[PDB]
Design a protein around this ligand. Structure first.
Ligand code: NI
Ligand code: NI
Ligand code: NI
Ligand code: NI
Ligand code: NI
Ligand code: NI
Lengths: 553, 100, 101, 553, 553, 100
């Protein structure tokens, strides 16, 4: 039997060689591989394949996956392939060919009576996003982020308090405890950051032992060389990550002094470009060092017509020293080259919590338009650029904070945090958001309707976000010390617990597709950014995709 | 009024449509959510007037044309579905390719 | 057509049938109004109401349940009482009985 | 003392002989009996009866009911009577005459200091509805159903997944466990259905042992004779119910073949008419068998002008074989005759979750209009038709799934799940919804208002739907096996647990007021339904009551 | 160095001698004292004071406060002073001078690494309000009250039931238990009232032992002399408070008879003016007695043009005996003189749950306008009037119900329930509401915005109102007996528990700034109120502040 | 704006009234929720203008007549109650038998 590739694409989604446009951008992905056996694809429906004795086997629950995402077009740092996805015990079981071994060939993902089915033919499946720059200003941010496709949130705060408005810090044991408890009510995996600004190591150890998976050094609390050193010392001791927002005022020294204080120790620099904070006007030079894991906040991504104008007030003498067109324009290119490895929000403190994914793709769109194909690109597609950019908000953030053994990518053994997208709405509005094996939130039509599709259709929380179900499907990250001291039992945390590790050994070279260490310099007077003497710059966009075509406001 | 969840839910659609209606009046080319809201509200009022399902399935395809919406929008909306209380109870109205 | 309309059959209902009743003249000697409810033990009403308390022992107002009779200051009127039933044990009110009878 | 019947009706509600119009329909009920003693009715208010020493006694909490619904007009399968209702320990204590035995005669329901009062004079009180065809597509369905007056929901699903969109199945142990846990957050009693489509009995036993109170056989998973037999075998073993959605395609055989496979064993046939699924075009003939408990989904109730037109797309060659005007018109009559015993929704999969009660009464209205009085009717009222129809969504569903020992009717010892209605809004919008002795949801006006009546008035959750209170007032149904294996403790379920029993012994004859087994045939070419050779049909309604007069949209 | 007082006021808020207008009223407060050391004030921000080694010390968590509210203008019954507030372990640690003892002088509140900061410069900080007349008609009332600044709610009810609509009673053990459990879900401290109307003491003891912190005597349940006596006897036994709503009908006797029945025992008279219930027309005379703690409900505060007209229907022969212009006008003055000690709502039963604070200040505004300065006033300010009125909804209610050892005022050792206000919105819309050391609710702008300030800005729940965090920050009040019997463990209550004590020993003299016992009389025919023969009256307001300038509807 | 729950709650009533207002304009006979919404919104705007409670209690009975609403509707609405912020604070306005 034969079938035209078009009819095939309509029935089971695209296959090897077929290209798909990501939303309304100019980025095109091409299916690199297909793990199916033509003619043996699994489809669910009346008279279709997944039925007793046919595509569904006679095996017991222990011998079959709990969930199968059929004919999914995976987009991950390791590849863009067409395959079936098996989920078991809340984790990624396998990526391959689903079906019944009794009558079907090459079945690697067994479907049985205990198997639920999610039809993904014609859909793009990605790992949940991970935002490592969250200001816990309000609990509502969690749902906003979940809706956008971000399944893990790392940050600090106690609520709408002055300290939190400005920094990602959950100050001391009492607040840390309270926030760990409140975390059980939120539908995303969470990790907290404590206040790392202190020159007494015991004050820091207490916080780590209390539960935080990292320490935030912020200039508002005093980002001095003494404070920085003290935080890194405790970090090397307790295997936790340090996030830095350097001395913008150059009060205690310049950028090189801070770099000296850090002493080659691992550190994650927040908003490395500078607008969101850091030594004026050259904190961006930090991305040249091997021990630096650099990320960007999202208001500056990408450089557009209104960027500069809006930034002055979101900030409001050091304003015009902080907001620079030169470094802002360069930042986009540095992302395209792999010099900047992560993207984050900086939620409600110069950042948009639900625009991390959206903005990263807009930067990719703009760079393709301005610079063309990347040197690593093969074939007539943007596969490598896509892999480079998706890594910025998935695997890299996960490596940076020592949680990549649990989440960050679609790999066997990791927690099943997946986002299903329709090509037309990729990176803007997802079709399904799965937390730990359960749909946590998805667009839903009229509740009293005969079908789930009638209007109005808006995102509503599902069973994966309800009480005990939620606890079983989310993770609360603790520091090894906190886990050992039995914090989870003492606070009576009800969610699953995961411990962070490998925060001190990760380096720039470990950043997937984003390990560039450029010989970058910044002119002290003109603020011009140069890599190997070449000027790095770009043009501001007048109109962007993934914008006015999708939003009501 | 004793409004049920579904009645309150439709109030959202109605308001979403008011937004679109005013922008259409300004002479703008509508986007994805604006279009879906506008056509849906039209059908709801249709059921209020007592028009049949058959009639609305056709009438709904003449609310917005390809020249009144942003590029790609028509392709993003293969159909629109909404339920309302007709004189004979709740019914589903499905408009296929509403924008041509 | 009126949604949820009643179609009450014409006629009347006889209240508290087969129970001992008695009439008494009551006069409000107080300067403030007093209103009594259908099941209140009449013998223990506000001391300002002058009447034969002894005859009102074990009785309440023979009126539709829930309703009440009002006595403006200086008002004098004849009311019909109906005897308590059940165990005929009186508890509460002004605390004058607190037991059977 | 005397009082005119009209003034009486206004004060304590209607009495023996008085008729009341159900909403804006043509159905009239007549008060058959009154359990009061004229002159001793209990009324609450300033100067009224329920007061210390008067209507309120001196007994301790153990000797008086927790709640009393005064002067209620009960409408149940067993009668339409005027009486007081006593509730104690979350259950129905008694139906009779409330008051204080110290001074009042014939008191059967003692009112004390511990007694709360709900004034029901002029109100109709019914048992909470029970929907046995729920697709757990989204948690929001629970509130929608509660608002309509449905207090118990039986079905399957894991959320907005392809399998759930199509079938009422909660596939395997893991999903079953997760959904049982999520159930604790919903304000309705719940029972889950697993995937019964498999030819290996152990795969089914696992699900029953996991927690499900039934198994759903759906054609989308393969409703073959082998699968059917396997499900029924396990059902007879574990005392659980089987719900069937037969082979529409006639792939494995015709209707008679399926009937053969069932082999006289008890089975609940979903949407027996056919439009919602089943052997084309004669699955409706199933209602003639004694071992069949037949129910209807609600989109087809009642037959109206737009019915056929809307159904084609809600379905979208076998479309015109599935959607038939002939069987649809006959279905209404079969309900009026008692051949179809239950009504359900088929929530968001060709059914409206909040229209189960509403539609059942519209069918009754239409049938009275078309066929006049039923043969069982006595007097000039529609009492029997009302009792026949109310049984369809209360007691019958409860018997069908082995939970009638807990809910389903207003009888002593059963869980106190009651719905208070104002005659004008009967079956459309309830005045109060009581779950296990507590008001779970009710219409509520301005929260800051001086009274609870000012606008806007819309349904809002009450204390009976809050945290631990909710757990104490709702029931999670488990299979005897699951209960024995200690599933509730293992999953740490916080709600009350009830076990299902008597699912295999119930038969068509046991259906209250709906035990007709007609000699029904369906013409293979014309699709005409005939009972004893007589053609069964009806006319489509152009306008229906309980519609445009009550809804804003 | 020097600085102009104006620039100072703009930078750190007003200081000694500076006056501030409360909202849009005519009431002016003057800063009486300032606990700072000019030049050493603590400010948070980039380059500001609270930084490592500077305003932030090197002490461990145990040696520093968890939270500091900087440069706050406190307004409390004891004073209007400018100072820093330290909060530790969810309680008020100290009021004084915050900073780092290493380099700063006079530091009494230590700031360390574990210290979160809330900037209160230019803000007024007050204790959370306490409403002792709550009808638990619906859970939504809790959020409404919290938003207004009321952190503690005392009352009774089971939901929208007839008994609750009319009285503040949670009838019997079963309902009491259920409501205690439901309380864990609400973001305010709660105490329940049971039905005190019964002549059998054991029926009352059961309720107290069940969990209630008081008993409500309501005429609708029979406010007879026997019932009253029985309730007070049990109250003196179990150390709980009695709330009274006397016999309006004068059925069992007149006001003097009730007073006789009470026999000099402590009792809290609800809505003492009369409109909301009580002996017609002289229940107001109750405020002359030493054992009476009198309060007002809020619909009558203050006397305005529409007051009388609206009241007839909110009530609907004894209507015109209950609603009297004479007693209503006098009530405002009696409040100004300190004859009435508390203010409450009477939520949804002739009272507005979110207008307790707002109305109290409107009464103060109107009285200043009509009567000028109080005799106790010193200086050209309204400091004493402010202290007299704020005590009415904070400390006095707390003393009245035996919970002043936990809440009621901003004093060391008490639970940290504070409300931050901007002068322009004082008493109308608060900036921050802190429950037990955590922000429970506050106005919040666009969740996806770059800052928390963009529109729309509306009150949204914060972390202090989430799951376990909420439980740790709220209090459930139990009677000593209930606490002893282990009710909290039996019901498995998850919130913190506090026990009431000192309810029988509190008297009129103990009411802060409101201990006046006037020789008051009421003319039986004309209803005129006279104190020492002088006529007490006032003029109705045509327009009021804190009204149309702040609300959208 | 710092909208409180009650302000946001009234926004629902206001929007519900917009629905009714437009349908009344079309010449339809209003149903139960539509009527209650319309009359309520009228009173709220009345309090905004500063009219007295006494005045509104009367004016509210002349918003809709028996000929502008579906059969049975007048009988379903024995009275309408709503609160709004008058110049002198929140007040309750009760209109008895608003539709005649
Ligand atoms: Ni920063
Ligand atoms: Ni930040
Ligand atoms: Ni089906
Ligand atoms: Ni179904
Ligand atoms: Ni009262
Ligand atoms: Ni009250």
């Amino acid at each position: 039997s034969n079938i035209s590739r078009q009819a095939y694409a309509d029935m089971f989604g695209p296959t090897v060689g077929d290209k798909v446009r990501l939303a309304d951008t100019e980025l095109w992905i091409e299916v690199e591989d297909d793990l199916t056996t033509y003619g043996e694809e699994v489809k669910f429906g009346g008279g279709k394949v997944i039925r007793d004795g046919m595509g569904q086997g006679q095996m017991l629950a222990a011998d079959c996956v709990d969930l199968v995402l059929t004919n999914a077009l995976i987009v991950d740092h390791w590849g863009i392939v067409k395959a079936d996805i098996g989920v078991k015990d809340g984790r990624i079981f396998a990526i391959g060919k689903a079906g019944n071994p009794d009558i079907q060939p090459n079945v690697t993902i067994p479907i049985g009576a205990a198997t639920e089915v999610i039809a993904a033919e014609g859909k793009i499946v990605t790992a949940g996003g991970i935002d490592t720059h969250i200001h816990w200003i309000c609990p509502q941010q969690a749902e906003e982020a979940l809706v956008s496709g971000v399944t893990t949130m790392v940050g600090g705060g106690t609520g709408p308090a002055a300290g939190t408005h400005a920094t990602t810090c959950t100050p001391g044991p009492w607040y840390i405890s309270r926030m760990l408890q409140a975390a059980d009510s939120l539908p995303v995996n969470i990790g907290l950051l404590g206040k790392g600004n202190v020159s007494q190591p015991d004050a820091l150890r207490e916080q780590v032992a209390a539960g935080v998976i990292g320490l935030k050094i912020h200039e508002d609390w005093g980002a001095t060389p003494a404070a920085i050193d003290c935080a890194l010392t405790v970090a090397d001791e307790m295997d936790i990550q340090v996030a830095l927002h350097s001395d913008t005022l150059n009060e205690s020294g310049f950028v090189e002094d801070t770099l000296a204080a850090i002493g080659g120790r691992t550190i994650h620099t927040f908003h490395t470009e500078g607008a969101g904070g850091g030594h004026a006007p050259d904190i961006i030079t930090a991305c040249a060092h091997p021990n630096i894991l650099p990320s960007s906040t999202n208001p500056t991504l990408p450089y557009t017509l209104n960027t500069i104008d809006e930034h002055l007030d979101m900030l409001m003498a050091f304003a015009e020293s902080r907001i620079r067109r030169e470094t802002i324009a360069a930042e986009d290119v540095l992302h395209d080259l792999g010099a900047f490895s992560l993207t984050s929000s900086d939620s409600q403190a110069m950042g948009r919590v639900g625009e991390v994914i959206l903005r990263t793709w807009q930067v990719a769109h703009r760079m393709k338009v301005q610079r063309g194909a990347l040197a690593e690109e093969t074939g007539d597609n943007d596969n490598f650029r896509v892999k480079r950019y998706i890594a910025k908000y998935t695997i890299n953030p996960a490596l940076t904070h020592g949680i990549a053994h649990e989440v960050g990518s679609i790999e066997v053994g990791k927690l099943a945090d997946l986002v299903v997208w329709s090509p037309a709405f990729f990176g803007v509005k997802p079709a399904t958001v799965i937390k730990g094996g359960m749909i946590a939130i998805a667009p839903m039509g009229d509740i009293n309707a005969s079908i789930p599709t009638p209007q109005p259709v808006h995102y509503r929380p599902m069973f994966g976000a309800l009480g005990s179900a939620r606890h079983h499907c989310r993770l609360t990250f603790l520091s090894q010390a906190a886990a050992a001291n039995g914090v989870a039992e003492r606070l009576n945390l009800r969610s699953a617990i995961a411990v962070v590790k490998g925060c001190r050994t990760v380096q720039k070279a470990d950043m997937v597709h984003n390990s560039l260490q450029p010989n970058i310099t910044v002119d002290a007077q003109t603020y011009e950014v140069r890599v190997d003497g070449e000027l790095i710059t770009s043009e501001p966009a007048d109109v962007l995709p993934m914008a006015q075509r999708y939003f009501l406001f | 009024m004793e409004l049920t969840p579904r009645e309150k839910d439709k109030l959202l659609l109605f308001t979403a449509a008011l937004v679109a209606e005013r922008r259409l009046a300004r002479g703008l080319k509508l986007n994805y959510p604006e279009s879906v809201a506008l056509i849906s509200a039209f059908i709801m009022e249709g059921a209020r007037d007592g028009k049949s399902v058959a009639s609305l399935m056709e009438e709904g395809r003449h609310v917005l044309t390809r020249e009144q919406v942003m590029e790609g929008v028509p392709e993003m909306i293969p159909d629109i579905q909404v339920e309302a209380t007709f004189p004979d109870g709740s019914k589903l109205v499905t408009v296929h390719n509403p924008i041509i | 057509m009126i949604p949820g309309e009643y179609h009450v059959k014409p006629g009347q209902i006889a209240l508290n049938t087969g129970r001992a009743t008695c009439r008494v003249v009551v006069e409000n000697h107080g300067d403030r109004p007093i209103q009594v409810g259908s099941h209140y033990h009449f013998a223990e009403v506000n001391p300002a109401l002058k009447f034969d308390r002894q005859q009102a022992a074990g009785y309440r107002l023979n009126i539709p349940a829930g309703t009440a009779v009002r006595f403006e200051p200086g008002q004098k009127r004849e009311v019909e009482l109906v005897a308590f039933a059940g165990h005929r044990a009186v508890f509460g009110f002004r605390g004058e009985v607190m037991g059977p009878l």
